[PDB]
RNA sequence: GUCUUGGAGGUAGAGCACUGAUUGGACUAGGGGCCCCUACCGGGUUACCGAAUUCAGUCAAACUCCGAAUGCCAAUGACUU
RNA sequence: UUUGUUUGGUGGCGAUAGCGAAGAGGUCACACCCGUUCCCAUACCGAACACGGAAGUUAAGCUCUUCAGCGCCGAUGGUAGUCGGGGGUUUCCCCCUGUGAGAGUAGGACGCCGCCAAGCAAG
C-alpha cells in the first residue's frame, strides 16, 4: 500500500513546485484503471472457452463482468447480444497494489525493457497499453497451455495535457524509449 | 485622529471606551454609495482604520470596503479577543478597550500596491498546505503578525502585497511553528 | 481527463421525476426534506400558493445535541417539525423524499414525524 | 343575419431548420490515371472525385423552422327578422 | 417585533432565463474532501448509492460583475397571397373597396416575480 503514500510524499510538493498551481487540489493524481479482455474466443466461434474469466480473476483483485455485443459487425456473423470478452474496473488500494505487482514482475516479464514511448495517448491524459503477449504473472505457466491471452489495460488520470501523463508515468517509473 | 468604521452601535461604544477617535457605522453587510464617499473623504482628510470581527460578516465587509477605497488603514482583533471563547465573544463589544488599543498599535495599510519578496513556493515549503498545518499555522501567523487569517492563496497575496520584512517574518515563523512543537 | 458531474444535479432530476406524480394542496401540504453533508432540513409547503407553513433544521438555536448528520438528529428534527405543524393546525400531509432513497436518515425523520401525530 | 370576443386547423404563399432532388466555386488525406519511377519508397499531378467540409444558387402532392384571407365551432351583449 | 441586506432551500412566468468568453468569492452556508465496523450498496468496484467524520481546498460545482461572439425575441413600412365586385387576347392576366403574410430590417436582451430558514445590521 505504501506505494501511494510515498507517491504523495514525492509528487505533491514536486509536481506542485515544478508546475505552479494556485491550489493543491489541481494536482493530477491517478484515480481509476480498467483492463479490457475483449476476446471472447476472439472470434466468438469457440463458444466454449472462458479461461480468460478466471485468469482475469486471480490476476486481479476481483472477478470480471462479461460484456456483450449490440450490433451486426460485418467482420463477424454471430453477433447479436452474444458475450465477447469481459472487463475489470478498480480504483482503491487494489488499483495501487496491482500497479506495484505489475511494475515489479511484468516489467521484467517483458521481452524488451523499452515498453512504449508516449505516442499512444489521447492528449488530455490517458495511456493505452498493447497486450498481445501471453505471460503476465507466472501464476499461469502450465495451467495455461500458451493460448492467446491478450488484454487491453487502459490507465487514465485527471490530467489535461499529454505531458502530465508523461511525467506521471515517469516519476513512478515505466519502461519508455529512454 | 482617524475615523473608525465598525458594524453597529455596540462596536461604536466599545471603541469609544478605548481611544478618542470618531466612529462611522457600517450597519452590517449593507454599505451604501454615500457611505463609501464618506469613507473616501475620511481617508483623504483624517484617515480611516477598519476594525471588524474576524467572523463571516465582519471579514466580508472588511474585504468589500478594502476593495472599495484603497489606501485605507486596517486593524485586526488580536488573537485573544478575536476568538469567541475570550471575554464575551468575537464582537468588538466583547473585547477589552486595552485590546482595542493594541489593535490600534498594529494598524497597517500604510503600504498598498507594492511589488515585494514573498514567494509562494517557499511558502508551501514552510508547510502552509494540507495536514491541518495549513490552516493552523495560517491562523497562528496571522494573529502573530496581527493581520487576521485567510486561505493560503489569499493570505499569501495580502502578505506579498503588504510591505514587511521577509526573513524577520521567517524567523517569527520558525518561532511560532516551534510554539506548535512546544517552543 | 475525465469529468465528474454534480451529484446535486442528478438529485434535482430525480426530485422532479418524483414531484411529477404528486402535489401538496392547502389540505395535504407536501412535507419536503433536504439533506446536506452536515445538516438536514424540512419544510411544510403548499403548492397552489408557494408558501411555507412550518420548518425545522439542525441549525436551530435549540437542540444542543451536536452531531448533525446523525440518524438521531433526524428523529429530533422530525418530531420538532411535527409539533410545529400540529400547533399550527395541520393533521395529514403527503410526503415526498426530495430525490433521495427512502432509507436511514430520511426514513428515520419520516418515522419520527409520523408517530408524533402526523397522518402519513 | 350582422357587430364584438375567444378558440381549434397547416391550404395559398413563403423557406431550406428536417427528408429527397440539384448547379458553380473553394478542398481533399484516400489516390484512382499519368508518372518521376510505383519492385515498394518519397515526390509534380492526382484532372483528384476532391469523401466530406465550406461558400454561394435553385426545387417538392406523399419536405416544413413559419403561415394568411375565407370557412367552421361557441359566448354575452346589441340591432333587426 | 418590523425593516434592510447576503446565503441556503423551495416555487411561478414561452431561452428576453440559453450557450460562449473574461474576471472576483468560501472561517457562515453549499460543496468538493476523509474512511468502511455495523444500515445499505456494486452483475466488478464505497464509482454512484448508504453510514460516519471534518484534514485540507475554491481547484471544480455554486454566488456575484462584465461583455451581443453563437443562439433567442422582434417592429414600422413595402410586396406575395386572398374575401366581395368587375373586365379581358382564358392552361392566364388586369382593375376596385377591404384584409394582409413569409423573408429582410430598426431594435430588445447575457432574467424577472414569490415564500421560508439562517447571518448581520437598524428600530
Ligand atoms: Mg406552393
Ligand atoms: Mg405543401
Ligand atoms: Mg414577419
XYZ file of C-alpha atoms (C1' of nucleotides) and ligand atoms in Angstrom:
688
model
C 0.000 0.000 0.000
C 2.911 2.286 0.912
C 3.359 2.992 -2.789
C 0.662 5.661 -2.948
C 1.952 7.044 0.353
C 5.437 7.726 -0.979
C 3.844 8.820 -4.256
C 2.020 11.592 -2.430
C 5.155 12.389 -0.420
C 7.252 12.941 -3.531
C 4.823 14.118 -6.182
C 2.575 16.544 -4.320
C 5.349 19.042 -3.489
C 7.397 18.144 -6.574
C 4.622 18.439 -9.137
C 3.305 21.500 -7.318
C 6.632 23.341 -7.468
C 7.549 22.269 -10.993
C 4.050 23.165 -12.228
C 2.953 26.231 -10.293
C -0.695 25.562 -9.494
C -2.645 28.019 -7.379
C -4.445 25.261 -5.454
C -3.171 21.859 -4.400
C -6.457 20.263 -5.474
C -5.322 20.792 -9.070
C -2.554 18.191 -8.819
C -3.367 15.383 -11.278
C -3.097 12.113 -9.381
C -4.193 8.761 -10.722
C -7.772 7.755 -9.946
C -9.053 4.699 -11.826
C -7.908 1.918 -14.118
C -9.679 -0.642 -16.291
C -8.473 -3.673 -18.237
C -10.475 -4.893 -21.228
C -10.061 -8.520 -22.220
C -12.287 -8.080 -25.263
C -11.575 -11.545 -26.630
C -14.497 -13.926 -26.140
C -12.947 -16.702 -28.271
C -11.506 -13.672 -30.127
C -13.830 -14.872 -32.901
C -16.782 -15.814 -30.628
C -16.843 -19.096 -32.574
C -15.069 -21.243 -29.990
C -18.217 -20.589 -27.937
C -16.983 -22.770 -25.070
C -13.665 -21.489 -23.682
C -13.702 -18.871 -20.940
C -10.381 -19.455 -19.149
C -9.983 -15.713 -19.697
C -12.503 -15.032 -16.947
C -10.741 -16.916 -14.150
C -7.257 -15.850 -15.174
C -8.570 -12.288 -15.055
C -9.929 -13.055 -11.589
C -6.770 -14.298 -9.968
C -4.515 -11.820 -11.754
C -6.786 -9.025 -10.497
C -8.386 -8.488 -7.110
C -11.956 -9.244 -8.151
C -13.752 -11.151 -10.834
C -14.616 -9.516 -14.157
C -18.028 -8.861 -15.672
C -18.679 -10.230 -19.141
C -19.582 -7.819 -21.934
C -21.923 -8.463 -24.865
C -22.444 -7.393 -28.461
C -25.029 -4.859 -29.593
C -24.986 -4.590 -33.396
C -24.122 -6.597 -36.519
C -20.355 -6.464 -37.095
C -19.552 -7.171 -40.743
C -16.262 -8.874 -39.855
C -18.375 -11.452 -37.999
C -21.641 -13.328 -38.391
C -22.994 -14.421 -34.989
C -23.023 -11.068 -33.207
C -26.387 -10.303 -31.572
C -26.271 -9.828 -27.815
C -23.728 -12.634 -27.565
C -20.968 -12.135 -24.974
C -17.485 -11.114 -26.125
C -14.768 -10.633 -23.529
C -15.068 -9.089 -20.093
C -13.610 -6.171 -18.160
C -12.337 -5.230 -14.714
C -12.562 -1.844 -13.008
C -10.710 -0.930 -9.832
C -9.715 2.309 -8.143
C -8.964 1.689 -4.460
C -5.841 0.160 -2.965
C -6.428 -2.826 -5.239
C -5.544 -0.429 -8.057
C -2.266 0.627 -6.457
C -1.179 -2.824 -5.327
C -1.902 -4.283 -8.754
C 0.160 -1.449 -10.218
C 3.021 -2.379 -7.894
C 2.836 -6.101 -8.618
C 2.793 -5.114 -12.288
C 5.811 -2.808 -12.268
C 7.648 -5.341 -10.119
C 7.378 -8.516 -12.230
C 5.626 -7.853 -15.533
C 8.032 -5.032 -16.343
C 10.802 -7.654 -16.059
C 8.396 -10.160 -17.636
C 8.757 -8.198 -20.885
C 10.899 -9.259 -23.832
C 12.275 -5.707 -24.053
C 12.631 -3.057 -21.355
C 11.591 -0.237 -23.703
C 7.829 -0.510 -23.126
C 6.422 2.239 -25.333
C 7.078 5.948 -25.565
C 4.250 8.405 -25.029
C 2.841 8.003 -28.538
C -0.449 6.211 -27.777
C -2.406 8.698 -25.667
C -5.437 10.959 -26.082
C -3.843 14.330 -25.448
C -5.611 15.250 -22.213
C -4.205 12.478 -20.038
C -4.523 8.721 -20.501
C -2.483 5.709 -21.544
C -3.416 2.648 -23.508
C -1.216 -0.423 -23.443
C -0.524 -3.014 -26.096
C -1.214 -6.588 -24.966
C -0.750 -9.347 -27.499
C 1.656 -11.069 -25.091
C 0.895 -14.213 -23.132
C 2.621 -14.338 -19.726
C 1.835 -11.582 -17.228
C 2.484 -13.375 -13.954
C 3.907 -16.918 -13.678
C 0.699 -17.710 -11.787
C -0.347 -19.177 -15.154
C 2.552 -21.251 -16.515
C 1.349 -24.818 -17.184
C -2.290 -24.395 -16.175
C -2.213 -22.206 -19.278
C -1.163 -24.005 -22.455
C 0.011 -20.706 -24.048
C -3.263 -19.986 -25.820
C -3.686 -16.390 -26.942
C -4.258 -14.320 -23.787
C -4.005 -10.662 -24.704
C -5.687 -7.752 -22.991
C -6.356 -4.026 -23.230
C -5.332 -2.322 -19.997
C -6.051 1.407 -20.002
C -4.894 3.697 -17.223
C -6.418 7.172 -17.128
C -5.745 10.229 -14.994
C -7.225 13.590 -14.071
C -4.807 15.389 -16.379
C -5.273 17.794 -19.271
C -2.092 17.579 -21.388
C -0.131 14.542 -22.548
C 2.938 15.919 -20.757
C 1.198 15.224 -17.448
C 0.747 11.580 -18.402
C 4.416 11.515 -19.392
C 5.701 12.961 -16.133
C 3.331 10.849 -14.035
C 4.264 7.519 -15.579
C 7.919 8.542 -15.367
C 8.062 9.624 -11.723
C 6.868 6.176 -10.667
C 8.974 4.548 -13.381
C 7.741 2.904 -16.564
C 9.778 1.483 -19.453
C 9.746 4.033 -22.254
C 12.086 4.750 -25.157
C 14.612 6.447 -22.890
C -7.463 61.290 14.757
C -8.570 58.907 12.022
C -12.105 57.630 11.579
C -13.013 54.142 12.789
C -15.594 52.117 10.867
C -17.428 49.348 12.723
C -20.534 47.200 12.386
C -23.028 48.931 14.667
C -23.602 50.921 17.840
C -22.174 48.191 20.087
C -18.733 48.329 18.490
C -19.151 52.119 18.468
C -19.425 52.220 22.258
C -16.656 49.627 22.582
C -14.106 51.546 20.507
C -15.122 54.851 22.084
C -14.422 53.325 25.507
C -10.806 52.745 24.400
C -9.390 55.602 22.283
C -10.639 59.042 21.241
C -11.457 58.646 17.548
C -14.602 59.376 15.565
C -16.757 56.437 14.518
C -18.634 55.613 11.317
C -21.271 52.874 11.308
C -21.418 50.240 8.576
C -24.789 48.811 9.698
C -23.911 45.239 8.796
C -23.233 43.989 5.298
C -25.344 46.820 3.833
C -22.908 49.533 2.710
C -24.107 52.484 0.645
C -22.549 54.637 -2.048
C -22.676 57.826 0.030
C -21.161 55.731 2.818
C -18.247 54.932 0.507
C -17.919 58.641 -0.256
C -17.806 59.396 3.464
C -15.034 56.814 3.786
C -13.221 58.436 0.859
C -13.289 61.906 2.394
C -12.389 60.427 5.793
C -9.290 58.709 4.411
C -8.436 61.880 2.497
C -8.747 64.286 5.438
C -8.127 62.303 8.637
C -7.742 58.665 7.587
C -9.716 55.539 8.398
C -8.780 52.249 10.065
C -11.175 49.352 9.518
C -11.619 47.201 12.614
C -14.221 44.428 12.429
C -14.610 40.965 13.886
C -12.779 38.006 12.268
C -16.155 36.400 11.531
C -18.063 35.907 8.289
C -19.897 39.269 8.066
C -17.012 41.194 9.608
C -14.386 39.784 7.269
C -16.755 40.194 4.326
C -17.447 43.875 4.980
C -13.725 44.357 5.612
C -12.813 42.875 2.231
C -15.533 44.836 0.443
C -14.528 48.211 1.857
C -10.852 47.388 1.288
C -11.618 46.755 -2.381
C -13.764 49.907 -2.326
C -11.340 52.624 -1.186
C -7.605 51.865 -1.445
C -5.059 53.319 0.949
C -7.443 52.952 3.891
C -5.674 51.750 7.021
C -6.625 48.495 8.719
C -6.529 46.811 12.120
C -7.356 43.330 13.381
C -8.628 41.854 16.618
C -5.569 40.264 18.282
C -5.510 36.529 18.867
C -7.006 36.729 22.353
C -10.236 38.691 21.922
C -10.619 37.821 18.225
C -11.870 34.389 19.317
C -15.310 33.866 20.818
C -14.126 31.930 23.876
C -12.330 35.017 25.238
C -14.236 37.765 27.009
C -17.815 37.805 25.775
C -17.123 36.588 22.241
C -15.855 37.778 18.885
C -17.660 41.119 18.686
C -15.768 44.346 19.277
C -18.351 44.815 22.034
C -16.724 41.710 23.562
C -13.073 42.826 23.646
C -11.270 44.976 26.177
C -10.522 48.654 25.477
C -6.857 47.815 26.026
C -7.255 45.193 23.302
C -8.617 47.936 21.051
C -5.516 49.943 21.949
C -3.333 47.031 20.838
C -5.288 46.758 17.585
C -4.648 50.479 17.118
C -0.975 49.739 17.761
C -0.968 47.145 14.953
C -2.546 49.387 12.300
C -1.457 48.568 8.755
C -2.096 49.563 5.096
C 0.475 52.329 5.106
C 1.579 50.254 2.100
C -0.929 49.269 -0.546
C 0.313 48.265 -4.003
C 3.950 47.167 -3.871
C 5.938 44.519 -5.738
C 7.621 42.608 -2.940
C 9.534 39.449 -1.992
C 7.116 36.788 -0.734
C 7.471 33.519 -2.645
C 4.517 31.139 -2.849
C 6.829 28.175 -3.474
C 8.952 28.694 -0.369
C 5.662 29.418 1.395
C 4.368 25.916 0.719
C 7.849 24.683 1.619
C 7.221 26.219 5.040
C 4.212 23.899 5.255
C 1.162 26.069 4.621
C -0.745 23.365 2.710
C -2.622 20.261 3.837
C -2.105 18.274 7.025
C -4.086 20.808 9.101
C -0.888 22.777 9.431
C -2.005 24.931 6.509
C -4.914 26.456 8.388
C -3.415 26.033 11.854
C -0.174 27.883 11.135
C -2.077 30.295 8.899
C -4.255 31.376 11.820
C -1.230 31.323 14.121
C 0.995 33.529 11.971
C -1.897 35.828 11.093
C -2.718 36.509 14.720
C 1.045 36.612 15.362
C 1.676 39.464 12.933
C -1.825 40.664 13.899
C -3.163 40.511 10.345
C -6.045 38.036 10.621
C -6.478 34.661 8.965
C -7.343 33.654 5.415
C -6.862 30.875 2.915
C -3.409 30.027 1.621
C -3.602 31.970 -1.630
C -5.395 34.998 -0.192
C -3.138 35.210 2.863
C -0.124 34.846 0.582
C -1.487 37.605 -1.643
C -2.114 40.059 1.175
C 1.328 39.354 2.633
C 3.080 39.598 -0.754
C 1.362 42.964 -1.255
C 1.957 44.018 2.378
C 5.391 45.639 2.662
C 7.077 43.924 5.601
C 10.463 42.321 6.144
C 10.779 38.804 4.753
C 13.371 36.949 6.813
C 12.410 38.515 10.140
C 8.920 37.193 9.488
C 10.510 33.860 8.581
C 12.294 33.798 11.935
C 9.000 34.645 13.632
C 7.514 31.783 11.596
C 10.148 29.430 12.978
C 9.283 30.725 16.449
C 5.561 30.087 16.003
C 5.987 26.632 14.475
C 8.212 25.819 17.440
C 5.380 27.003 19.683
C 3.275 24.421 17.858
C 6.080 21.956 18.549
C 6.144 23.363 22.085
C 8.535 26.318 21.981
C -9.047 13.795 -18.383
C -12.393 12.611 -17.044
C -15.089 14.864 -15.626
C -17.390 14.229 -12.678
C -20.878 15.698 -12.642
C -22.670 17.379 -9.762
C -24.465 14.785 -7.666
C -26.913 17.540 -6.781
C -27.879 17.726 -10.455
C -28.954 14.088 -10.589
C -30.722 14.635 -7.280
C -32.653 17.527 -8.817
C -33.650 15.433 -11.810
C -34.879 12.596 -9.607
C -36.733 15.083 -7.420
C -38.524 16.421 -10.476
C -39.412 12.878 -11.502
C -40.900 12.229 -8.069
C -42.783 15.508 -7.820
C -44.294 14.869 -11.248
C -46.832 12.462 -9.746
C -47.886 14.357 -6.627
C -48.580 17.826 -5.301
C -49.418 19.386 -1.969
C -52.564 21.467 -1.666
C -53.788 23.539 1.277
C -55.256 20.344 2.763
C -52.411 17.873 2.182
C -49.403 20.203 2.098
C -46.322 18.362 0.936
C -43.600 17.798 3.514
C -40.210 18.290 1.921
C -36.820 17.267 3.265
C -33.304 18.391 2.394
C -30.100 16.555 3.269
C -26.671 18.181 3.325
C -23.186 16.948 4.084
C -23.623 18.418 7.565
C -27.293 19.027 8.283
C -30.896 18.207 7.460
C -33.867 20.460 6.778
C -37.620 20.080 6.446
C -40.316 22.466 5.230
C -44.090 22.111 5.161
C -45.032 23.543 1.780
C -48.259 24.200 -0.079
C -48.014 24.341 -3.854
C -51.027 26.297 -5.105
C -49.726 29.411 -3.338
C -45.992 28.761 -2.974
C -45.990 29.337 0.777
C -44.154 27.619 3.607
C -46.203 26.701 6.658
C -43.611 25.229 9.024
C -39.946 24.337 9.131
C -37.183 22.854 11.258
C -33.486 22.144 10.909
C -30.338 21.280 12.808
C -29.375 24.952 12.504
C -31.831 25.955 15.215
C -30.577 27.672 18.332
C -32.128 24.832 20.347
C -31.344 21.094 20.162
C -27.992 21.255 21.930
C -27.253 17.776 20.568
C -24.288 18.497 18.299
C -23.723 15.585 15.964
C -25.647 16.934 12.957
C -25.586 14.324 10.266
C -26.960 11.789 12.745
C -29.843 9.469 12.254
C -30.911 10.514 15.749
C -30.718 14.208 14.879
C -33.117 13.378 12.062
C -35.522 11.971 14.637
C -35.289 15.111 16.756
C -35.902 17.479 13.872
C -38.758 15.292 12.662
C -40.578 15.345 15.968
C -39.970 19.080 16.308
C -41.440 19.924 12.915
C -44.300 17.560 13.702
C -45.107 19.537 16.838
C -44.792 22.830 14.969
C -47.233 21.644 12.316
C -49.627 20.295 14.939
C -49.819 23.541 16.897
C -50.410 25.376 13.622
C -53.391 23.115 12.960
C -52.272 20.548 10.388
C -53.256 16.885 10.540
C -52.414 14.952 7.366
C -49.778 15.562 4.714
C -48.340 13.855 1.674
C -44.609 13.259 1.929
C -42.055 13.421 -0.845
C -38.474 12.286 -0.376
C -36.688 15.071 -2.187
C -34.815 12.796 -4.534
C -33.020 10.616 -2.031
C -33.696 6.982 -1.205
C -36.247 6.040 1.457
C -33.572 4.927 3.879
C -31.773 5.592 7.119
C -31.635 9.311 7.862
C -34.605 10.495 5.824
C -36.737 7.488 6.735
C -35.842 7.942 10.394
C -37.047 11.529 10.186
C -40.209 10.359 8.453
C -40.959 7.799 11.151
C -40.270 10.267 13.954
C -42.665 12.796 12.464
C -45.152 10.031 11.666
C -45.592 8.643 15.162
C -45.515 12.186 16.546
C -49.021 12.846 15.239
C -48.799 13.473 11.513
C -51.110 11.350 9.368
C -48.926 9.678 6.746
C -78.279 37.793 -40.119
C -74.678 41.361 -38.583
C -71.228 43.826 -34.958
C -67.762 42.430 -30.578
C -64.738 38.494 -28.328
C -62.411 33.533 -27.744
C -60.928 29.033 -29.893
C -59.356 24.617 -32.987
C -56.598 23.626 -38.157
C -51.249 23.570 -41.576
C -54.264 25.037 -47.589
C -52.463 29.812 -50.875
C -47.935 31.909 -50.122
C -43.271 31.564 -48.496
C -38.431 28.922 -46.589
C -34.352 25.295 -46.542
C -34.377 24.054 -39.891
C -35.657 18.034 -41.354
C -36.187 14.144 -45.948
C -35.271 13.754 -51.015
C -33.588 16.335 -55.809
C -29.700 19.908 -57.846
C -25.847 23.962 -60.199
C -20.955 26.581 -59.798
C -16.767 27.609 -56.825
C -13.292 26.820 -52.660
C -10.619 21.483 -50.641
C -9.334 16.676 -50.043
C -5.872 12.959 -46.955
C -7.884 8.319 -49.934
C -5.397 8.486 -54.930
C -7.706 6.265 -58.568
C -4.573 7.784 -64.083
C -0.062 9.926 -65.588
C 4.199 9.289 -63.948
C 9.020 10.750 -61.586
C 9.833 5.938 -61.341
C 5.409 2.951 -58.045
C 9.775 -3.865 -57.144
C 7.602 -0.970 -52.529
C 9.658 4.014 -51.391
C 9.163 9.542 -51.160
C 7.655 13.308 -54.626
C 4.675 17.394 -59.549
C -0.013 15.759 -60.747
C -3.687 13.103 -58.996
C -7.653 16.145 -63.537
C -8.340 14.238 -57.557
C -13.909 12.589 -57.210
C -11.751 16.336 -54.461
C -15.040 11.973 -49.236
C -16.674 15.135 -46.647
C -16.483 20.147 -45.213
C -17.374 25.013 -46.662
C -19.012 29.257 -49.842
C -22.737 30.993 -52.730
C -27.759 29.083 -56.050
C -32.249 26.613 -57.423
C -36.882 22.878 -56.347
C -41.096 19.329 -53.739
C -48.836 16.038 -53.689
C -46.894 11.898 -50.278
C -40.403 18.323 -47.488
C -41.950 22.176 -43.231
C -38.179 26.245 -38.562
C -43.161 29.547 -40.499
C -48.021 30.749 -42.192
C -52.888 34.164 -44.222
C -57.558 35.546 -46.474
C -62.126 32.629 -46.063
C -64.816 28.888 -43.903
C -66.076 26.221 -39.039
C -67.343 25.967 -33.503
C -69.026 28.794 -29.222
C -70.129 33.058 -25.873
C -72.854 37.545 -23.972
C -74.375 41.692 -25.302
C -76.695 44.792 -29.006
C -79.823 45.843 -33.599
C -83.042 43.601 -36.999
C -86.053 39.367 -38.709
C -41.323 42.761 16.784
C -40.868 45.339 11.762
C -37.250 46.958 8.119
C -32.890 46.468 5.216
C -29.412 43.068 3.196
C -26.430 38.263 1.948
C -26.538 32.842 1.628
C -29.334 28.173 1.511
C -33.931 25.836 0.363
C -38.299 25.708 -2.411
C -41.826 27.682 -6.368
C -44.194 30.783 -10.941
C -43.511 33.072 -15.606
C -42.521 30.900 -23.656
C -34.259 30.807 -23.535
C -35.629 38.351 -23.405
C -33.836 32.924 -18.060
C -29.936 29.956 -23.194
C -24.765 28.829 -24.837
C -19.540 31.249 -25.112
C -15.784 34.419 -23.035
C -13.499 37.233 -19.177
C -12.823 38.123 -14.041
C -13.817 38.068 -8.424
C -15.508 34.950 -3.765
C -15.921 30.150 0.962
C -13.942 30.819 8.874
C -21.324 31.187 7.795
C -23.692 28.258 4.331
C -23.070 24.805 -0.150
C -19.571 21.968 -1.718
C -15.731 19.149 -3.066
C -12.882 16.146 0.642
C -11.533 11.664 4.626
C -12.841 6.185 5.752
C -15.884 1.483 5.526
C -17.106 -1.673 11.767
C -22.296 -2.112 11.566
C -27.650 0.454 7.664
C -27.301 -0.320 2.694
C -24.949 -0.980 -1.895
C -21.898 -2.651 -6.904
C -23.796 -8.232 -12.390
C -16.679 -5.624 -10.708
C -15.585 -1.633 -7.880
C -17.718 2.815 -1.036
C -17.505 4.778 -8.848
C -22.600 6.111 -7.745
C -25.970 4.683 -3.817
C -25.777 4.302 2.024
C -23.361 5.303 7.243
C -19.951 8.362 9.872
C -16.165 12.264 10.126
C -14.173 17.272 9.349
C -7.570 17.046 7.400
C -7.239 20.309 3.512
C -9.326 23.494 -0.751
C -12.079 27.483 -4.045
C -9.110 23.821 -7.905
C -14.377 22.196 -9.804
C -19.829 22.985 -8.720
C -22.257 27.230 -6.564
C -22.869 33.097 -5.936
C -21.629 37.740 -7.870
C -19.618 41.677 -12.185
C -18.797 42.422 -17.293
C -19.245 41.675 -22.473
C -24.200 40.851 -28.008
C -19.280 36.206 -30.488
C -23.372 31.904 -31.327
C -28.321 31.124 -30.133
C -33.441 33.849 -28.666
C -37.287 37.704 -29.118
C -38.874 41.391 -32.702
C -41.310 46.111 -35.017
C -42.867 50.219 -38.961
C -43.241 50.434 -43.905
C -43.419 47.750 -48.551
C -44.528 43.423 -51.531
C -46.750 37.952 -52.281
C -51.437 35.928 -51.419
C -56.731 36.454 -50.869
C -62.964 37.522 -49.350
C -66.513 40.519 -52.232
C -67.409 43.261 -57.015
C -65.971 43.968 -62.309
C -63.089 43.223 -67.457
C -60.301 40.838 -70.697
C -56.471 38.070 -76.456
C -58.501 32.463 -70.985
C -53.513 26.193 -69.334
C -53.560 33.156 -67.782
C -53.719 38.279 -66.822
C -55.750 43.391 -65.375
C -58.837 46.885 -62.187
C -61.675 48.404 -57.498
C -63.492 48.867 -51.521
C -61.174 45.634 -47.778
C -57.603 42.092 -45.200
C -52.696 41.084 -45.233
C -48.021 37.312 -44.526
C -43.057 34.799 -45.047
C -38.289 36.750 -45.755
C -35.315 41.010 -44.573
C -34.618 45.276 -41.154
C -34.882 49.039 -36.864
C -34.355 47.203 -32.360
C -34.544 44.243 -27.393
C -31.931 41.173 -24.450
C -26.463 37.868 -21.064
C -33.677 37.364 -16.496
C -37.752 38.957 -13.824
C -41.615 37.647 -9.880
C -42.735 34.927 -4.578
C -42.464 32.147 0.189
C -39.332 30.030 4.351
C -34.908 29.498 7.167
C -30.189 31.170 8.750
C -26.262 35.547 9.258
C -25.577 40.760 10.166
C -27.400 45.477 10.852
C -31.176 49.197 12.443
C -35.566 50.038 15.132
Mg -46.874 26.346 -53.267
Mg -47.203 21.990 -49.057
Mg -42.916 38.985 -40.064
